[PDB]
Design a protein around this ligand. Structure first.
Ligand SMILES: CCCCCCCCCCCCCCCCCC(=O)OC[C@H](CO[C@@H]1O[C@H](CO[C@H]2O[C@H](CO)[C@H](O)[C@H](O)[C@H]2O)[C@H](O)[C@H](O)[C@H]1O)OC(=O)CCCCCCCCCCCCCCCCC
Ligand code: CLA
Ligand code: CLA
Ligand code: CLA
Ligand code: CLA
Ligand code: CLA
Ligand SMILES: CC(C)=CCC/C(C)=C/CC/C(C)=C/CC/C(C)=C/CC/C(C)=C/CC/C(C)=C/CC/C(C)=C/CC/C(C)=C/CC/C(C)=C/CC1=CC(=O)C(C)=C(C)C1=O
Ligand SMILES: CCCCCCCCCCCCCCCCCC(=O)OC[C@H](CO[C@@H]1O[C@H](CO)[C@H](O)[C@H](O)[C@H]1O)OC(=O)CCCCCCCCCCCCCCCCC
Ligand SMILES: CC1=C(/C=C/C(C)=C/C=C/C(C)=C/C=C/C=C(C)/C=C/C=C(C)/C=C/C2=C(C)CCCC2(C)C)C(C)(C)CCC1
Ligand SMILES: CC1=C(/C=C/C(C)=C/C=C/C(C)=C/C=C/C=C(C)/C=C/C=C(C)/C=C/C2=C(C)CCCC2(C)C)C(C)(C)CCC1
Ligand SMILES: CC1=C(/C=C/C(C)=C/C=C/C(C)=C/C=C/C=C(C)/C=C/C=C(C)/C=C/C2=C(C)CCCC2(C)C)C(C)(C)CCC1
Ligand code: OEX
Ligand SMILES: [Cl-]
Ligand SMILES: [Cl-]
Ligand SMILES: [Fe+2]
Lengths: 37, 341, 65, 30, 38, 36, 505, 34, 34, 81, 167, 33
């Protein structure tokens, strides 16, 4: 049986990392207060 | 070569206003929602639903005129002209707030029409349909605010009335009753709206101040050609500027313009979610930890506790007139009031 | 690709990819059922909403007694 | 512990600022 | 039985039909008179 | 066919709005809606 | 490489791994059901279905098991309060175990399909290409859906071969699982009639069998196949999402307004039952009937089942909660223990006085007493200096009839004011606040939490309908417009009909 | 050799016509008095 | 009642006046449609 | 560019202004008479300055029932007769 | 504290009824709309340069000489969504439009705050409508005013010894 | 303050889990070239 031909690689560049982290950190900082209530 | 294909042909002709299949839903409804509003704001009262005047005929100006919501006694009745409440009497329909549902429903179907229009013109021209997609954010705001909110509530009476000052009243309702400013979904909406206006001005001014000198005249507009293949500003100089002024800057023109789509569309979507919670009085009204300290410790004061006094003033002072159907009677001695005022 | 007993059995159910009736086919008929189902959903909605009022249809909790 | 949590996130954002600026992928032409 | 609101339902139902019908009557006509050359 | 100079249509039209709007503003001070 | 937001596109032309991912999703969802139920069982207190029903206790899945007839625990309790029962294997716990075994068997099946993705079954015999005949698949699945919808109505709900469903009287006092006969007439479309739920499933079950049959045998028209890109599995996702959000709005609304399938003993009351003093009307009907029938005050009120008076209390109104006020309703006002009695205010003249009730809109509300005519005769003043209606000045008293305080009168103004303040919530209860260390702030009910989630999810799925619908109809330009588009196709008047070069001039 | 009556003609007049009617009723209103 | 004809008369003359003034040119357009 | 007649060529055209110096003012007058005759008040049910309250009254005639609402506003209106 | 500030400003100046705040909203809603419109329209007319398995964003390389979208095609779409002449075919006018609209509107809302500092407040139509007897006939402005009052009487509840809050 | 004790586990997981995800995909992106 042949190995699956539908596999692709995944990419996350460094700007997308910075954008993602900024998003999560700001989200955490907006909601943290409501979680502590 | 049948009648359908013939009609498709005629609907899809290139003319001063394209029509399309979507025009068949859109145009009747867009025209009626708009005629409804102009008609009611010029001639129609709010006396029997609200105890308010609301037309030019009655002496209101453009700021105070409005098509107001039906009386709270109508519940969520569709208020069809031909239905059990107005029984086909056009005059009674108007007086019961039948034009509120008329505007809101034809409006709702007009918005569908418009988004299908964007779909139809984008397919026939061969572009990608991201303008249509972006318009999903206006729709979600509309349906959550004007439909879902009062459906969670006791009646249409508590949706927004269609009018400038009337929408002002609605903003203050949500402060006093929902403490909506505290709500993390409104804040993200706010970040989205202002984020967008910021992106709007900053991208427009950057293009206009990294222009290439392409003509001899002091008016730099004349020297763009819509068919030129050449970028009309330097992305490179614009990047170096913002890198050196701000620390980071865009390098990708596609990411930039996609981000301009993303930011405002997302903020509106977040606020829509927040209003849905409010449909059920699921507010972000209080911080519990604050209330327990403040109850026990009368020297503890924050801007959080200050604003809930202000909300308390709003509720008590506006409720009787803003909700006549509850016949509230607050004798003087029970109104909350700071010293002297 | 891998043959299996159960595959051979289900084989004809995934065998007519791309087969269509000609032209318009049953579309006019489909459209009828569509029109009916809509009016039927109007009735259901207007009963729930109380713009349709029917004898012996007491739309309330009190209709469980 | 609430105070600590708030300051740690804020602190992290400032450090992310730092890397996003001095340790960006550098833009390169054509 | 046959209630007022049911009478009204059919009024609304039949009026929507007119408007749609009449509207598509007009539209078929015009598409037939003013065809694209091709 | 092009017999009226367009600048003319524009000054008359323009004055026409000016008139009707000033009516609407005079009426904020007279009659219904004036506080009187 | 693939961007992060596109990783799962690798399944689009791999039917086996698509089945493997779908199996894993199913396994995780059945897994969740099992774990939620066990956590609920580990925290449910079944000792008082009157003042501490499941819906005060933050129970989310318990009530759905009870709604279809699972009412009992291997521990011997049932939710009706019967002690001594024996439910067989299909107890709350057995339902939970089942879903976990299911989760585990589904997980293995997924391993097998991921590894053996290259099944001949999935290949078009002509071309050798992966290919799913979606039109016939629709007819097969539809036909199965009708069999099950039919059988579920025909056997489970009737009691023919099964337990029936939860039914109750209009005031949620005597609910139970009973078989239901269908209602075939017009009142079967009344949401508050449970026989219409039976009729619906039998009738729709047959329609789905028949249509199923139609969709297996009759090929789609060429016009529709082309218009709806029926060779494209993403069209099925576009329309499938649209259907799911249609259905999520509906279940949201029936939860909020209430229907025969959202009974108040499982989910709690509605806000509208507070707006319209629904339970209060009925309470008053009984005290007047007791009384005309020659009972005393003490007797007429003592005659009031506590369960009924507990509905007549804003603390159980689902529209008094808050978004980040978490946990059960018991975490807020506490665990209800007893009814204190119905409170009666009289001024110094002996007029009966009525505390004006708090509306769902108001986090806080003043204390205002009125006579049977709506005329204000007392209040708790804010500014004291010009006050003229103080309980002190008017000599307001409270007497209690029924309940724990039955036949007791208080007259000292601070105590009177105290009950006046609770009277705005409706009927007056004694709460346990230590046990859950309750903070005294109202939470919402499962009725509230379920409406909120499904109304939100549905709205979000609207955008999923729009995204994947656009992607089906514009697949050909997903990556960009034609680089040799020419300004004649896009300039005006070039073509009589837009985007159709056969109509040049 | 243009046409007079077009879809465009219709849209234009759909809005123009009742715009003036309204501007005339509203004009009359400035003279209503209590 | 009588107020309605009052209101309606000017619209009719506006119709008749535009009717008669445009009639000749409007006929050529219908002929031209084959 | 799509075959209609250009706007700027219409509103300077003499045939245009011949028709419209009649239609525009006839419409402006129609709409006037709609208000001046008092008809607009009756088509829409809008209260006149003298018919919001009855002389010694200070209550709103707020509608308060759903299926009797027609009858309600009618009752309030006979209390002005 | 920001929210405290904007509540008190409304009770003391009726900023919502002030035209310059209405233009700031117009600037700030209009800005967000034009941001989305411009972003969706450029995004709709990207020229194909990538495959289905990659970010179209990789179709642009920093510093490329050619433009990366077809504006004629974008004009052609938005022109037909409205009509031809309500849409831009010149990129310079378009980008200056994006700049000017939110900038101007926010000049005004900043001027509004600057001028309500000298208590030239928003329009006041409290009791502007009365009947033939002389009764007040409320509008939505009077409702606003009631909410405004509830703010007035509660804010800085201990700090006022005399009947008017004159600053 | 008398604050919600799961607030802390909640915030930490809210932050950590999406972050680790982004990092994992970034570092293996760099390991390719
Ligand atoms: C995104 C895409 C956008 C495209 C959308 C295109 C436009 C769509 C237009 C559709 C119009 C729908 C309006 C439905 C009106 C409504 O609901 O009408 C209300 C009625 C229910 O009626 C209400 O019923 C309430 C409860 O009463 C009940 O309770 C009372 C108190 O005990 C009494 O017992 C009474 O007898 C009993 O009926 C109150 O009486 C209200 O006054 C009365 O209006 O429902 C009904 O018609 C039907 C309700 C069930 C169907 C679900 C509706 C789904 C949408 C709602 C989802 C939000 C739900 C809120 C969540 C937040
Ligand atoms: C064409 C677009 C369009 C759309 C989408 C709508 C949509 C709507 N209108 Mg609007 N309306 C339109 C055009 C449209 N209207 C036009 C052109 C006018 C001007 C005449 C109006 C005037 C108008 C008024 C005055 C009112 C509405 C109202 C409504 C709402 C209720 C309609 C209803 O119950 O339908 C019911 C009817 C249908 C759904 C039609 C279904 C057609 C069936 C399937 C065919 C039946 C055919 C027949 C039985 C077969 C032959 C039988 C035999 C005897 C020969 C709804 C939002 C009401 C509203 O807003 O309430 C607040 C309202 O009061 N409309
Ligand atoms: C810093 C100030 C600020 C900012 C930037 C915002 C921003 C926002 N607010 Mg918040 N607000 C604020 C302060 C602010 N707010 C304060 C202090 C309060 C007091 C509590 C409120 C109270 C408040 C309420 C009560 C609501 C908002 C809402 C919103 C959102 C509205 C989005 C929108 O465009 O809807 C505009 C409307 C639409 C986009 C709907 C569709 C529009 C269609 C396309 C109309 C088409 C027009 C048609 C062509 C014809 C018109 C012609 C005619 C007029 C001539 C947005 C996120 C709303 C929200 O969250 O919505 C979910 C909402 O209901 N705000
Ligand atoms: C072997 C069969 C089986 C049985 C008997 C049950 C039985 C139960 N499950 Mg489990 N479950 C199963 C399989 C099964 N499950 C699987 C495979 C999964 C993984 C998805 C789950 C996941 C699951 C969850 C997540 C939950 C349950 C729950 C429950 C309980 C309530 C069920 C309920 O209210 O459904 C209600 C179901 C519906 C209302 C579905 C309606 C279907 C809609 C209307 C679609 C119609 C579309 C159709 C194609 C169109 C038809 C056309 C027509 C013309 C015919 C009950 C004990 C609940 C519970 O209490 O858990 C503890 C719960 O929350 N189950
Ligand atoms: C439809 C789903 C659903 C619903 C309605 C409920 C409902 C309920 N659950 Mg259950 N639960 C669910 C799913 C659900 N659950 C799942 C999936 C799990 C496993 C995680 C559990 C695990 C669970 C436990 C362990 C407990 C409950 C409990 C409860 C009850 C109270 C919960 C509460 O206070 O919520 C509070 C809700 C909120 C504070 C709202 C949070 C919403 C956040 C803020 C959204 C995030 C925003 C996002 C990040 C924004 C970014 C977007 C943008 C950038 C794109 C209530 C009956 C409790 C109970 O009483 O049990 C007896 C309890 O202890 N649930
Ligand atoms: C049955 C539902 C369903 C299914 C099967 C799919 C399937 C797909 N979508 Mg659609 N989509 C849906 C619903 C669905 N979508 C809805 C409701 C929305 C609106 C929110 C979208 C919005 C959407 C967009 C905008 C895009 C897709 C794309 C895609 C494809 C790639 C997605 C991917 O790799 O995700 C990868 C996602 C991750 C690796 C992480 C996401 C983590 C999220 C943000 C939080 C996770 C929540 C948590 C797991 C709990 C589950 C949620 C709850 C509902 C149960 C794939 C074909 C993409 C596409 O078109 O590519 C061609 C794309 O760009 N979808
Ligand atoms: C000590 C401590 C604890 C301090 C306390 C301080 C304090 C109180 C902090 C509170 C923080 C707080 C919680 C804030 C929360 C903020 C909040 C509400 C979050 C929003 C979250 C959210 C997800 C909202 C949804 C909407 C959303 C997606 C909005 C995004 C907004 C956003 C980031 C917009 C972009 C902003 C902007 C300035 C962009 C700069 C762009 C820029 C570089 C352009 C320059 C440029 C232009 C060109 O034209 C060209 C050509 C080039 C080349 C070019 O480069
Ligand atoms: C993967 C793992 C990483 C995921 C974890 C990420 C953390 C996310 C945190 C989110 C939860 C925040 C909870 C903080 C409060 C907490 O302590 O409560 C914990 C609460 C329970 O609350 C506890 O209950 C106790 C008795 O059981 C007592 O009352 C305790 O005092 C009380 O804290 O738990 C739940 O509510 C969990 C599930 C809630 C989900 C249902 C609501 C869904 C509503 C739909 C929202 C969708 C919106 C989409 C928006 C787009
Ligand atoms: C409702 C209804 C209906 C219909 C209706 C309609 C459709 C209407 C229309 C209407 C319209 C269609 C209207 C219009 C109006 C208009 C107006 C009223 C205008 C005004 C304007 C002005 C005032 C302006 C001015 C100005 C300024 C201020 C500034 C800027 C510039 C200018 C100059 C513009 C029907 C029949 C179905 C029946 C039922 C109901
Ligand atoms: C195909 C299709 C579909 C489906 C469809 C269907 C499923 C259908 C159904 C249908 C139906 C299922 C229908 C029904 C109907 C019904 C009716 C319409 C009825 C009526 C009734 C009446 C009207 C009656 C009356 C009365 C009364 C009430 C009382 C007295 C007597 C009398 C008789 C008068 C869809 C959508 C998915 C889409 C795609 C396509
Ligand atoms: C293997 C096996 C087995 C076993 C099994 C088991 C043991 C299972 C488990 C399972 C389970 C144990 C599962 C569970 C699941 C869970 C889930 C899957 C969850 C989910 C979650 C989520 C998704 C959430 C979300 C969220 C959050 C977190 C926050 C809030 C909001 C929301 C809701 C969004 C047996 C022996 C039988 C057989 C053989 C094999
Ligand atoms: O500090 Mn801050 O807030 Ca301006 O007014 Mn006077 O002062 Mn006080 O009062 Mn209102
Ligand atoms: Cl303050
Ligand atoms: Cl002072
Ligand atoms: Fe740009």
């Amino acid at each position: 049986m042949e190995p699956n031909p539908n596999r692709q690689p995944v990419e996350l560049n460094r700007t997308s990392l910075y954008l993602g982290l900024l998003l999560i950190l700001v989200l955490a900082l907006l909601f943290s207060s409501y979680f502590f209530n | 070569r049948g009648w359908f294909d013939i009609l498709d042909d005629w609907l899809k002709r290139d003319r001063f206003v394209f029509v399309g299949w979507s025009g068949i839903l859109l145009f009747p409804c867009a025209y009626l929602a708009l005629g409804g509003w102009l008609t009611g704001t010029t001639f129609v009262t709010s006396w029997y639903t609200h105890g308010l005047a609301s037309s030019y005929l009655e002496g209101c100006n453009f700021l105070t005129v409005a098509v107001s919501t039906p009386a709270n006694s109508m519940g969520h009745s569709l208020l069809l002209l031909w239905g059990p409440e107005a029984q086909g009497d056009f005059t009674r329909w108007c007086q019961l707030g039948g034009l509120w549902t008329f505007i809101a429903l034809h409006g709702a179907f007009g918005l569908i029409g418009f988004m299908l229009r964007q779909f139809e013109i984008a397919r026939l021209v061969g572009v990608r349909p991201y303008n249509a997609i972006a318009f999903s954010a206006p729709i979600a705001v509309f349906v959550s605010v004007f439909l879902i909110y009062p459906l969670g509530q006791s009646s249409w009476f508590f949706a927004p009335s269609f009018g400038v000052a009337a929408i002002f009243r609605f903003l203050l309702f949500f402060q006093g009753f929902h403490n909506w400013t505290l709500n993390p979904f409104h804040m993200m909406g706010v970040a989205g709206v202002l984020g967008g206006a910021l992106l709007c001005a900053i991208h427009g001014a950057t293009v206009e101040n990294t222009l290439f000198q392409d003509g001899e005249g002091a008016s730099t507009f004349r020297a763009f050609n819509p068919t030129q293949a050449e970028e009309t500003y330097s992305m490179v100089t614009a990047n170096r500027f913002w890198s050196q002024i701000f620390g980071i800057a865009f390098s990708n023109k596609r990411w930039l313009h996609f981000f301009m789509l993303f930011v405002p569309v997302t903020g509106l979507w977040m606020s829509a979610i927040g209003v849905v919670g409010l449909a059920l009085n699921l507010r972000s009204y209080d911080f519990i930890s604050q209330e327990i300290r403040a109850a026990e410790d009368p020297e503890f004061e924050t801007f959080y506790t200050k604003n809930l006094l202000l909300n308390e003033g709003i509720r008590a002072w506006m409720a009787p007139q803003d909700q006549p159907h509850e016949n509230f009677v607050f004798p003087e001695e029970v109104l909350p009031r700071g010293n002297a005022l | 690709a891998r043959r299996t007993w159960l595959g051979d059995i289900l084989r004809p159910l995934n065998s007519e990819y791309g087969k269509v009736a000609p032209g318009w086919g049953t579309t006019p008929l489909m459209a009828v059922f569509m029109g009916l189902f809509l009016v039927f959903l109007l009735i259901i909605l207007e009963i729930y909403n109380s713009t349709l009022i029917l004898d012996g249809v007491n739309v309330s909790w009190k209709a469980l007694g | 512990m609430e105070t600590i949590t708030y300051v740690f996130i804020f602190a992290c954002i400032i450090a992310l600022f730092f890397f996003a600026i001095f340790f960006r992928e550098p833009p390169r032409i054509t | 039985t046959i209630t007022p609101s049911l009478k009204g339902f059919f009024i609304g139902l039949l009026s929507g039909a007119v408007v749609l019908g009449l509207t598509f009557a007009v539209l078929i006509a015009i598409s037939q008179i003013d065809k694209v050359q091709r | 066919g092009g017999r009226i100079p367009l600048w003319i249509v524009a000054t008359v039209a323009g004055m026409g709005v000016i008139v009707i709007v000033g009516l609407f503003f005079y009426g904020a001070y007279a009659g219904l809606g004036s506080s009187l | 490489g693939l961007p992060w937001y596109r990783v799962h596109t690798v399944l689009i032309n791999d039917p086996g791994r698509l089945i493997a991912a779908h199996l894993m999703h199913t396994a995780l969802v059945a897994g969740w059901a099992g774990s939620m139920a066990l956590y609920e069982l580990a925290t449910f207190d079944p000792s008082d279905p009157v003042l501490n029903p499941m819906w005060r206790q933050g129970m989310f899945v318990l009530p759905f098991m009870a709604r279809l007839g699972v009412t009992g625990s291997w521990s011997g309790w049932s939710i009706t309060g019967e002690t001594g029962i024996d439910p067989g294997f299909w107890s709350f716990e057995g339902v939970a175990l089942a879903h976990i075994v299911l989760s585990g068997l589904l997980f293995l099946a997924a391993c097998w399909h991921w590894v053996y993705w290259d099944l001949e079954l999935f290949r078009d015999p002509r071309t050798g290409e992966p290919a799913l005949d979606l039109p016939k698949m629709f007819g097969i699945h539809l036909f199965l859906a009708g069999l099950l919808c039919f059988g579920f109505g025909a056997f489970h709900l009737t009691g023919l071969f099964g337990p029936g469903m939860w039914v109750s009287d209009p005031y949620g006092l005597t609910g139970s699982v009973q078989p239901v006969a269908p209602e075939w007439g017009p009142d079967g479309f009344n949401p508050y009639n449970p026989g219409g739920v039976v009729a619906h499933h039998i009738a729709a079950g047959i329609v789905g069998i028949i249509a199923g049959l139609f969709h297996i045998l009759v090929r789609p028209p060429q016009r529709l196949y082309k218009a709806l890109r029926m060779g494209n599995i993403e069209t099925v996702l576009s329309s499938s999402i649209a259907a799911v959000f249609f259905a999520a709005f509906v279940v949201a609304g029936t939860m909020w307004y209430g229907s025969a399938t959202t009974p108040i003993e499982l989910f709690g009351p509605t806000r509208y039952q507070w707006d319209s003093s629904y339970f209060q009307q009925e309470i008053n009907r009984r005290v007047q009937a007791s009384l005309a029938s020659g009972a005393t005050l003490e007797e007429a009120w003592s005659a009031i089942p506590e369960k009924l008076a507990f509905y007549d209390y804003i603390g159980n109104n689902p529209a008094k909660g808050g978004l980040f006020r978490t946990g059960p309703m018991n975490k807020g006002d506490g665990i209800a223990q007893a009814w204190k009695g119905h409170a009666v205010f009289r001024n110094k003249e002996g007029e009966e006085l009525f505390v004006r009730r708090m509306p769902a809109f108001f986090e806080s509300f003043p204390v205002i007493l009125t006579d049977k005519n709506g005329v204000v005769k007392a209040d708790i003043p804010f500014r004291r200096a010009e006050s003229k209606y103080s309980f002190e000045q008017q000599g307001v008293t409270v007497s209690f009839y029924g309940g724990e305080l039955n036949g007791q009168t208080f007259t000292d103004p601070p105590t009177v004011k105290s009950y006046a303040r609770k009277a705005i919530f409706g009927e007056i209860f004694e709460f346990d606040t230590e046990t859950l260390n309750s903070d005294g702030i109202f939470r919402t009910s499962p009725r509230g939490w379920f409406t909120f989630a499904h109304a939100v999810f549905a709205l979000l799925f609207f955008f999923g309908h729009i995204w994947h619908g656009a992607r089906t109809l514009f697949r050909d330009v997903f990556s960009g417009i034609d680089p040799e588009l020419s300004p004649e196709q896009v300039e005006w008047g070039f073509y009589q009909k837009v985007g159709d070069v056969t109509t040049r001039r | 050799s243009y046409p007079i009556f077009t879809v465009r003609w219709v849209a234009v007049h759909t809005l123009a016509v009742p715009t003036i009617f309204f501007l005339g009723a509203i004009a009359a209103m400035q003279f209503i008095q209590r | 009642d009588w107020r309605v004809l009052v209101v309606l008369l000017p619209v009719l003359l506006a119709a008749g006046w535009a009717v008669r003034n445009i009639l000749p040119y409007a006929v050529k357009q219908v002929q031209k449609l084959l | 560019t799509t075959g209609e007649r250009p706007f700027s060529d219409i509103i300077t055209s003499v045939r245009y202004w011949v028709i419209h110096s009649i239609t525009i003012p006839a419409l402006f007058i129609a709409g006037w008479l709609f208000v001046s005759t008092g008809l607009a008040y009756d088509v829409f049910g809008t209260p006149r300055p003298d018919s919001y309250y009855a002389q010694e009254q200070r209550s709103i005639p707020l509608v308060t029932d759903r299926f009797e609402a027609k009858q309600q506003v009618e009752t309030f209106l006979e209390q002005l007769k | 504290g920001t929210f405290n500030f904007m509540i008190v400003f409304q009770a003391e100046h009726n900023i919502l009824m002030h035209p310059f705040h209405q233009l700031g909203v117009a600037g700030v809603f209009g800005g967000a709309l034009f941001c989305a419109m411009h972003g969706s329209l450029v995004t709709s007319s990207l020229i194909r340069e990538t495959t289905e398995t990659e970010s179209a964003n990789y179709g642009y390389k920093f510093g490329q000489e050619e433009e990366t979208y077809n504006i004629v095609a974008a004009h052609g779409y938005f022109g037909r969504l409205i009509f031809q002449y309500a849409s831009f075919n010149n990129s310079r006018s378009l980008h200056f439009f994006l700049a000017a609209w939110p900038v101007v509107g926010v000049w005004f809302t900043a001027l509004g705050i600057s001028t309500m500092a000298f208590n030239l407040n928003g329009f006041n139509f409290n009791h502007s409508v009365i009947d033939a007897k002389g009764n007040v006939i409320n509008t939505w402005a009077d409702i606003i005013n009631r909410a405004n009052l509830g703010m007035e009487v509660m804010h800085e509840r201990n700090a006022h010894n005399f009947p008017l809050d004159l600053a | 303050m008398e604050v919600n004790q799961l607030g802390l586990i909640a915030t930490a997981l809210f932050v950590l889990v999406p972050s680790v995800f982004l990092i994992i995909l970034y570092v293996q992106t760099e390991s390719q070239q």
